[PDB]
Design a protein around this ligand. Sequence first.
Ligand SMILES: CCCCCCCCCCC(CCCCCCCCCC)(CO[C@H]1O[C@@H](CO)[C@H](O[C@@H]2O[C@@H](CO)[C@H](O)[C@@H](O)[C@@H]2O)[C@@H](O)[C@@H]1O)CO[C@H]1O[C@@H](CO)[C@H](O[C@@H]2O[C@@H](CO)[C@H](O)[C@@H](O)[C@@H]2O)[C@@H](O)[C@H]1O
Ligand SMILES: CCCCCCCCCCCCCCCCCC(=O)OC[C@H](COP(=O)(O)OCCN)OC(=O)CCCCCCCCCCCCCCCCC
Ligand SMILES: CCCCCCCCCCCCCCCCCC(=O)OC[C@H](COP(=O)(O)OCCN)OC(=O)CCCCCCCCCCCCCCCCC
Lengths: 179, 174, 486, 64, 124, 90, 59
Amino acid sequence: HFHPYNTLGLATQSAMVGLGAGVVAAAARNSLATGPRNILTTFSKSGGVVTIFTGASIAYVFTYCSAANLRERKDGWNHMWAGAATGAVLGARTKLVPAFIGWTVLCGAACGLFGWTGARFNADRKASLEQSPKGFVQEDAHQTFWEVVHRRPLSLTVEQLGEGRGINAVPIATATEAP
Amino acid sequence: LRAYNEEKELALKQRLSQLPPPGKAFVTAKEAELAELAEIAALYKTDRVGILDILLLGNKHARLYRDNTALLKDYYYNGRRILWEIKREGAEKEDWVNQMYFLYAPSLILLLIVMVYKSREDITFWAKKELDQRVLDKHPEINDAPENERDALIVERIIAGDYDKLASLQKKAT
Amino acid sequence: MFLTSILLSSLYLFNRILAWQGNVKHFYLFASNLLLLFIVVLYINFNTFSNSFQFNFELFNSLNPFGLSNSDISNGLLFGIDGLSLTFILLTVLLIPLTLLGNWYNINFNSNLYYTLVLAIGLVILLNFWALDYISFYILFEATLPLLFILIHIYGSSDSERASFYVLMFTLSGSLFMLLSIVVISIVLNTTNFINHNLFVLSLDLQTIIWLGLFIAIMVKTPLFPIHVWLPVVHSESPLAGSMILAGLILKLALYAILRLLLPLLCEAQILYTPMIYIISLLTIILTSLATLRQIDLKVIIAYSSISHMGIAILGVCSNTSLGIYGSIVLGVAHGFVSPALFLIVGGILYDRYHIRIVNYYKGLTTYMPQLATYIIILSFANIGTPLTGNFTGEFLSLQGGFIRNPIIGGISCISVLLAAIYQLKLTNKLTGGISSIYMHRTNDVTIREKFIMNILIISTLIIGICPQIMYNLLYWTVNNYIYII
Amino acid sequence: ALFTSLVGASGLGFATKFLSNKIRLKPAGYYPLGYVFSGVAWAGLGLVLHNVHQHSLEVLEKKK
Amino acid sequence: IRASFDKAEEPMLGDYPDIDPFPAQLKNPYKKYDDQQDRRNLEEPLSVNDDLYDMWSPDRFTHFKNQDALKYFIGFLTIFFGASYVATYFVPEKAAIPREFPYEGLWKESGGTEKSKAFFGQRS
Amino acid sequence: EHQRPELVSFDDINYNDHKKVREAQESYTREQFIRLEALKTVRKALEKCYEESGPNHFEDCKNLAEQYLDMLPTHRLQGYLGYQRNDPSK
Amino acid sequence: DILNEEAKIVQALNNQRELTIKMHELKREEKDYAHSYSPLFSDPVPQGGSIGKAPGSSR
Ligand SMILES: CCCCCCCCCCC(CCCCCCCCCC)(CO[C@H]1O[C@@H](CO)[C@H](O[C@@H]2O[C@@H](CO)[C@H](O)[C@@H](O)[C@@H]2O)[C@@H](O)[C@@H]1O)CO[C@H]1O[C@@H](CO)[C@H](O[C@@H]2O[C@@H](CO)[C@H](O)[C@@H](O)[C@@H]2O)[C@@H](O)[C@H]1O
Ligand SMILES: CCCCCCCCCCCCCCCCCC(=O)OC[C@H](COP(=O)(O)OCCN)OC(=O)CCCCCCCCCCCCCCCCC
Ligand SMILES: CCCCCCCCCCCCCCCCCC(=O)OC[C@H](COP(=O)(O)OCCN)OC(=O)CCCCCCCCCCCCCCCCC
């Protein structure tokens, strides 16, 4: 089915990557600047970039792996919880409570909308319309995604929708027949 | 239809050039200056041209016209607000009442009349007649009854049998 | 040659009426009144006994780009009606001269511009109900918005700018995701069509995605609670005809679009989601009608009233019942009658005279204007759900259909009869009674043109109120069409 | 039809000449002969596009 | 200022006078105002949440404190239902039998079937 | 003139021609209206039974009342979409 | 007379639907070297660079 994650291993890999991105962005901030700057103002007038990269990396991957491990499935919700943790780390830099709540909620919603579309910038090859079976079914078969039919099985309607509202396993007519 | 005169209309504009603006011509809170303007208000009220002239003639005449009617229009309504001017009667036709009482209102009454009589052809009248027809088709012997009995006899069959055929359309269920 | 000679004659007659009369407004009234005559003659030749689309015509086909096309292969833009379309067209076309009437003396500066924009918006929402492709529905669904932007921006209150922006912004932003969903339909089926589209079945996981993109656009246009946000300001800072055409016709256009576009091919989706629609419908009836009580401005109250009535309307549509569908249609048509009369009462008789819309100035309008106060009360009571008016027929059959599908949602949906009365009569007794206001100097009684508009918009509620069967001859197909009870 | 395409493309030409008169702050019928000129030019573009579409359909018929 | 929601509106207002909310009814009626019916002078600053302090506002009784009146109302409520519920115990029995019915309790008469005699039936 | 169009069904027809699908659609629709007029006829007869009977309507037309309350859940407009989108026994 | 004019339009739209599905299949179909490169010189085989050429270099 699935495979659980190594939260400590993926977290320390991301911590090293965020440390590296912080050093690169601090050097790019020195060299693209004005005023008296030296070799030691890399981490002095840094603007706190290495804290941004480090905290965002560790929080997103730790909350993503922990939420994927306690739910025992991988879907778009884990990106929502991880993006909420990222928004918590980015929103604590502005030391205000309603700001913080806004950063958490909106960053979590944006990352959940990201992770629900596949969590990929690029395309998936087998899932797109162009590389998948489309059009009508040629004979009767299990109608896969992207396919059209004329008539659907009623057993599927009872299994997917329910046995309730106006919906029945037998139409209301021949359930009421004279013999 | 009717016709206008060019020279009268040029003389109208020559009259209008020596006249004050509409924002001055009545703001004096009589008949030395206020008696030439009510003439001009009747000149607005009278209609200079019909349909045969507007199609066939050029645009210089039409521009001269439109300037004349705009100035006469201001001299009519400003004098009606401050103070033919010095009357007070009831009979009058606003510009819209020609084609709202005589075209909008009768077409709306025509929409009412066609909705009311088009409601005769409804599914419920037709379905009642059809169900009576099916009962008369299966059991024709109630034809032989007199007038008052037959309807009642039809009801005794409507209760005694469904007469739908809706289980026959759903032949894929059984 | 004949139909081209008609146009070459009529454009010439137009140019001549321009050269001789400075306004056009006579010719615009004449044209829209002729459109009435034409559509009712189409109603006479309409066959009610056929479910079919009777008067079909293709535009912009390959083999004939300019005009009608009779070919074995069709890729243009289809157009045609059933009963369900035609009802709204009737409600459309009798509204169009009245707004052209409604500003007959208000607009002074640039007449021909304003009346051209108002008639052009009315023609676009005529052709909205004729359309038969998904794309040809959508091209004209959004043709309105430049005309609405230019109309709200140039003319209005002091706050014309922000209101014209919001009518572009929210309406656009919902309509884009609508386009996303239309594209996803048009690449699976390879056919946008209002005829065949109940035949095709999509996967439940694929209906699950498509339906969100259409439904959030209908959430924007029939303003349900998450985005009900542009509606009071685009009314409260509109001119008169823009507000009338908006709240009488655009909201009912999205009420039409939830029937025409969603209920045929999203059925198996639609059952899984009726509780979400009932959440949002009850939550936009309760919470918008409660926000009406704290209002300082006067056109804004009738705006939030329109929100509450459309919130009642859409839970008859998604009710999966004959009663609910018919009640939503009779609510939509009767609200399209009663509501522009209320925007006339706040905007025409009461903003043309005093030019300020704050409620606190207006008191005791009876003793100087008795027949206006007469109108204000009998249009108040027609709005609530007080019967023999057609608004109650819509509210009643909609609440009944909403009680079928889920009874507990109908129990709290039924208190809307109370909540819709509170703010409306709270406004009505403040306008009607008291010593006449020290701020308002006495002005003219209601003129003949305003009384004309009012008498028409009140008789047309009362006829539907006394007998709602007068338009069942159009809908008895389309009440049975959208029902999915296996 | 060939004829309606001609009349409508000439109508597009009348629209271009009208809008070009009216950017110039001229009257509508300022230079009336230019309506004929532009209408015949845009009608000729209609001729060309209609004939190209004829030939493309005739190529599609020959693939059977 | 005086009410709690008026204090809740305070951090929103900016360059607005923040005056004391006072009821337009509990103004005395005999002082001459511009509008006697509104009880309001021509240019008088309107309060934070005015329409609760309007003449068209609630009636706003002044003879009882509202918490006290809550107690008195619920007191009369509770004493009536408690007195009636306790007086259900001190009741006398009646002197007649509840009356009987022919044809086995008219069960055929009130619809009924021999298998449904218990649901549509009387005392016999 | 009381014309009677012919009944066709959803199952024998091809769904690729539109002439037969629309006829089956209108047919199933109109049959629901016929079935509904049978319901309304029994409601009219039950009202006449009650008004003639007076006090003994409990036993004069227990059967007509039970007939009406048994027909009411199953005799209404149901919709062609539910039968044409889904197939029983497949 | 209205059901037949339904069916004419639906036939004319299913014709366009099949026309599109065909013309979308015709794109992803692979194409010959004579159609998708130069028509003249239909071989991909080079024999390029023949002045000091060695026999046995052909394969
Ligand atoms: C309009 C409002 C905005 C709506 C935004 C749309 C985004 C919604 C996306 C939904 C959708 C695209 C459909 C969208 C088309 C309409 C687009 C509308 C406009 C687009 C703007 C992307 O579905 C995504 O869902 C994500 C989670 O929800 C998954 O995340 C990831 O999870 C991990 C898994 O490995 C990743 O490892 C991880 O990296 C991610 O965490 C992705 O796997 C998946 O691609 C669905 O696509 C997919 O659905 C499945 C069904 O199950 C289909 O399988 C079919 O069914 C089975 C037999 O029945 C058989 O398997 C198969 O034989 C058959 O093929 C696929 O065919 C496929 O196509
Ligand atoms: C700018 C937005 C983008 C625009 C995209 C859409 C462009 C629309 C352009 C307007 C032109 C459409 C209206 C005229 C076309 C219909 C004329 C016609 O002849 O209809 C033919 C139809 C059947 O005729 P036929 O099959 O030939 O048989 C006749 C037997 N007696 O006969 C009929 O069934 C009657 C048809 C009635 C049509 C009523 C339409 C109401 C609106 C009319 C004015 C539309 C102008 C709108 C201008 C604003 C642009 C949207
Ligand atoms: C078997 C069970 C038995 C149950 C019995 C117990 C039932 C108790 C529930 C009582 C509810 C009463 C109905 C509430 C709405 C009544 C509205 C109303 O009457 O407003 C009156 C008010 C004017 O009154 P006033 O100014 O005080 O005095 C005037 C005399 N000079 O008019 C105004 O000022 C207009 C503005 C205020 C309008 C009210 C706005 C808020 C409405 C809240 C409605 C709440 C509904 C749900 C109630 C839940 C109760 C549990």
